[PDB]
Amino acid sequence: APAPFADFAPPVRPQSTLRRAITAAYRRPETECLPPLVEAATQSKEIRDAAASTARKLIEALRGKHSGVEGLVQEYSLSSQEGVALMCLAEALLRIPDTATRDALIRDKIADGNWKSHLSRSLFVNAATWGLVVTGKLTSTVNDRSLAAALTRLISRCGEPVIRRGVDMAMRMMGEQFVTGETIREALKRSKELEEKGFSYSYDMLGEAATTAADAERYYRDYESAIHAIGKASAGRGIYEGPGISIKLSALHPRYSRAQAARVMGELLPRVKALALLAKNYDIGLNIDAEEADRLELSLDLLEVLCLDGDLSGWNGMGFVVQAYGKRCPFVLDFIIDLARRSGRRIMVRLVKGAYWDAEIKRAQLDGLADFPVFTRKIHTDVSYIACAAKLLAATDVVFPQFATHNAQTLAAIYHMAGKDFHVGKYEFQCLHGMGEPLYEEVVGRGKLDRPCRIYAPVGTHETLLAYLVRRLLANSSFVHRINDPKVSIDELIADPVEVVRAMPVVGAKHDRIALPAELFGDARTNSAGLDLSNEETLASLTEALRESAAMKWTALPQLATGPAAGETRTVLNPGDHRDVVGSVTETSEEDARRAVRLAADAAPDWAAVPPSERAACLDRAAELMQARMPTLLGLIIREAGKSALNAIAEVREAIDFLRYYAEQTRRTLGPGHGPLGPIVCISPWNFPLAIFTGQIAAALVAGNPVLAKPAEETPLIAAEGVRILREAGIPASALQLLPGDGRVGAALVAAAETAGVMFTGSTEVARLIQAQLADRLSPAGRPIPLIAETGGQNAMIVDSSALAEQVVGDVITSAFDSAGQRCSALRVLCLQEDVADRILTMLKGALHELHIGRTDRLSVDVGPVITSEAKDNIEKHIERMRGLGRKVEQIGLASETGVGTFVPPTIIELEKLSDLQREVFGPVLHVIRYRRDDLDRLVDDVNATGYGLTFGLHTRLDETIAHVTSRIKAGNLYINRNIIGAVVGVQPFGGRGLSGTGPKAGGPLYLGRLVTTAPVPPQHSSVHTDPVLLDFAKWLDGKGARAEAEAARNAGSSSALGLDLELPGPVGERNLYTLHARGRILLVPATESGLYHQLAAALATGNSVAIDAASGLQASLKNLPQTVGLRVSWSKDWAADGPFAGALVEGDAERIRAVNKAIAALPGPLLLVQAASSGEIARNPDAYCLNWLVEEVSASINTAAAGGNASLMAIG
Amino acid sequence: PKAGGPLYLGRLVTTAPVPPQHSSVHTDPVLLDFAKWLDGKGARAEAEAARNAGSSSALGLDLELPGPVGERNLYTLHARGRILLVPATESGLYHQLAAALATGNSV
Amino acid sequence: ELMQARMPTLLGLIIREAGKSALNAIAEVREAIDFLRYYAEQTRRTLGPGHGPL
């Protein structure tokens, strides 16, 4: 058996001094980065004046010669939406290959009227891109109804002439501006004109982010074929005068990442070498483009091997991009310059600012990292660029600097920095095709500055160029935007960033409007911190901490208030390798479980008397302890629960966030009148063995309740460690007792007489057993024992033909197979619109086969084991039933090493109907169904019809589809254009409805209120909206003479928070919404007319319909209802026939309540959140029925960066 | 339609244009249920007309109109209310229902 | 444009014929001007050959 973590994440090579200096700068505070850059970028006053004069001259020439789309908009008086819609139409018309066929469709069909009749795919799929072209603004989703109206309007107003102009404009832009040509041969033909003027070219075949082996092979052969064409055309001109190629490493391997570094070196490197050998033979440049920040250092390992490879010697065409917006840039340059010296290769170094700025900000915030790997003020990037240019210009004997910029100030500064001694081959400038030529036509040539410029020339079809055109077009801080803004003076454009930064009060301060990841929530609480698994220092330190964690003697014992108790002891084995003993658990006898509840009951007053602020301080101290102990906690979670390192980090972060969130919610709400329930039994699942465990216990404790913590039998060790941390943080032993063991221990705790509440997260079937146990029980006040039961899902994602396949596949692979599908939120049913289903399925299967399944103590493992052999057997029985029915089943092949553990390969099962699924299958099993677009509403019904309602995803660019689907789906956590596994505490408050939960949501503001006898008013919890049926009922009550009930009804209408609609603070590039809706149909079990009126008021005020128990005999109390109220009212003689219900209100004495609670628990389907009150309580207490539990929380997380950029961050420079 | 509003001119021609800004992303849910019912019974042309009406309806439009500072001037499209339907044929009734339901009305 | 330039004269007629104060006569003429310009602009935004008159 291999030692745990002995091969966790070894670096490709030992890190040299120069490499270590790169890693050390990865997230260096911005105030530390800038001073040396300012120093290196400083030039003499004479140079700065000459640079400003040159920049002004260039800018004056630019503004003096400065429209195609603008001219079209002007000529036809188009609104912006009309312009966008026209270009979308033109794009669609250009998908018709034959010109005569297109023109006939235009003249005879499109112009004459209904364009919709002649053009499965919305015309407006790419409207966000065309919106950027027309308006300069990015909108993440497309208002397809506005665009359709605008297209109809413009065609009916202007006819064929405007369509013709739009088609011709789109053809020119997509064929000649956004690309140099559609094919390398066309691009080469079009390059002769500017080559004759002194420009050169680097061709970009536009490949990027391979998702499958086949994609990577396609991009390879595209690069190889382009190299031949470019090399034939170069015809011996060499690497400086002649054209070259640019490649992206992500195009050449589907798993280009540090986590897969061994595959990258073994599989990607030979492909680059083969392309480089061909470039060498033709003597052309081959440049490696720079991508995301977490790929920088990995790419250096390839650059190192290639430059040291003797087979490539004699050729100086290898090139490499460095991004000056990155904090590591000067250190990367030091490394490259030294590599060039060692290898004797004159590396072509393209200095750029960087293309992924918005995404880098979002990623660092999502990952909770210490700082950004890029600057946050645009001027810092400018200074970085100029400083790095000074470094490169001192090294022209050993590297060939290539200054890629469209900024005339940047250009002029470097032109003068480089001085008057010039020869071709010393350095060059670079620019983008169809963007930089106006500037560089003022640079290239003896009559200008006599400096060469290489044009970066995209080559590809319409489909290829549109894929990432949004990123290429992206902002208010951009020079090209500012040059076209008449409000920006030339003096502003020639401002010297070096001197501006030098004079700032704090040199290098972070942008004021960009939150560090730790500060995402501002004053409310400190965000949990993650770990950067692309940072070699982090990987090396984590390796040691993980190894050290595997040497610890982890145990879990029955920790009663009186001390550890004896019991049956057994080992805890790693699910990925049963030979790896992780620790030992001593399980709780049912007698000691009952004893623990009695001890908790005796201890309840002493814990309730700890003021809420001090209880919250215990939670905050526990969060600090968990944060500090994260590396050790990761190792335990990895080995005990089959989690990968990434998933263990998320697990610990979630626990920290629960602690800090419930602490803050406590400080916002809890006072002397919110008395604790008493002893709370917290029963938790194995699959989030620290986060959910900690969340339930922390909430119960901070609400003033002593806790009996019963962790899942599979994962007691991390639970014991969480309890140890909470106790260290100040939770007394009497307030927090750990009771390891199986469901018998949970059941014994639930049945214990002093148990005052139950928090259960687990399977729906077990929750139903607990519901049955509790139906026997009443509190000493004669009321139901509160149960929070957060249960399973049958989670769907709907994908339409406007979604980007690569994005869908990434989110599907993550949502379905992360943690081997052992997340309650995991994607179970992918629903693909028929027109795109085959393409997406092919890509998905290709991506599936790139996953590494194995024991999770290796960073390269993507999918770990299932938790037990029983879980494996259950999942495999489902897979085989499906296979036996003829369903197509795609499965990864498992390595022989998996035999020592319990693994199920990620599996894709193609289904006929959603009804082919019965219950949740908690494993790595994705089901795929196809749907026709017109059946989308029926499909949403089918998703709802399972009775589950946990997570739901939708991938579409179309606002109409978003509005339709999100208004009709019934699930607690919705996700738009992203994965469906988000449960970021306080950002996506998590929890579902139906068979998926009773609520309230964990990680949301209603949670703590369920754990006290009188619920506080949560922060932000109110609504100005009044349910109109409630209002009609109140008027009906007054007309009946029920004056006090009418007043109570009006009060309920005001007190209801139905209609609350909030945006929760979170990361950039996402909108996280939280809304309160009706629950559905509430079962009313009244005893008296006044009780019925109060129950109906409560239910109607919260937007619900009702089914009233017909056995109450109260039919005559509801005569002559207004039709609006009658529509919401039904009478039920057989409650089981008239469900599912979404809650219940009960009136009666204690024994009536007990009997009704038993009858309600017997109803099929979802657990019902029941509220009961006596008739006297209804008379005495206006809040006898709490409106908090009569609404349903919905969280929706929208990825607003999905179109390729962040609109809001375009204004942050 | 309202004088001084964007629907007015369309009443004065025999085929109404699509007014500026006249659209809505919202689809009436009863319209949606009606279209599913039509498809269930095989009325394919009518179900298509129903879906098309659901999309072209501007019910739910909710705009702020440009005006003076210190004022918010809002313009919204709601259902008319209850529409009297006087059909002659089954298909005609289905088309009338589609139009009325798509615009949020009862009939 | 003509109503705008002739507003003072039009005001005088409205004041005397319809019993309006000067401020409300101004509002009357402004509203007429705005109708003219609004329906002109709405026309430029919408009307094409297939929108035949009644």
Ligand SMILES: Cc1cc2nc3c(=O)[nH]c(=O)nc-3n(C[C@H](O)[C@H](O)[C@H](O)COP(=O)(O)OP(=O)(O)OC[C@H]3O[C@@H](n4cnc5c(N)ncnc54)[C@H](O)[C@@H]3O)c2cc1C
């Ligand atoms: C020929 C060529 C090849 C290129 N190849 C690559 C490549 O392989 N990889 C890559 O990542 N980029 C590459 N780029 C650069 C990238 O695509 C942009 O074109 C470039 O960053 C724009 O810089 P500028 O001098 O043209 O414009 P400017 O207007 O001077 O600078 C804009 C840049 O400033 C930066 N920026 C904007 N806001 C902020 C902020 N708030 N804080 C910090 N920085 C900010 C960004 O880098 C932004 O792109 C290339 C550019 C060219 C011209």
Ligand SMILES: NC(=O)c1ccc[n+]([C@@H]2O[C@H](COP(=O)([O-])OP(=O)(O)OC[C@H]3O[C@@H](n4cnc5c(N)ncnc54)[C@H](O)[C@@H]3O)[C@@H](O)[C@H]2O)c1
């Ligand atoms: N809605 C959510 O937030 C959420 C979160 C995580 C997991 N889940 C669900 O949890 C399930 C997986 O976790 P699991 O396998 O540990 O679930 P489970 O239902 O098997 O076990 C959950 C817990 O209940 C205990 N238990 C078992 N039988 C009991 C009984 N008769 N009485 C009292 N307690 C009993 C177990 O010991 C364990 O502690 C999945 O169905 C998943 O969807 C839901």
Ligand SMILES: COc1ccc(CO)cc1
């Ligand atoms: C548009 O200029 C770019 C060239 C290459 C890259 C590689 O990421 C990005 C931008």
Ligand SMILES: COc1ccc(CO)cc1
């Ligand atoms: C609708 O035309 C109007 C003209 C003037 C006023 C102000 O009196 C109001 C309306």
Ligand SMILES: [Mg+2]
């Ligand atoms: Mg179980």
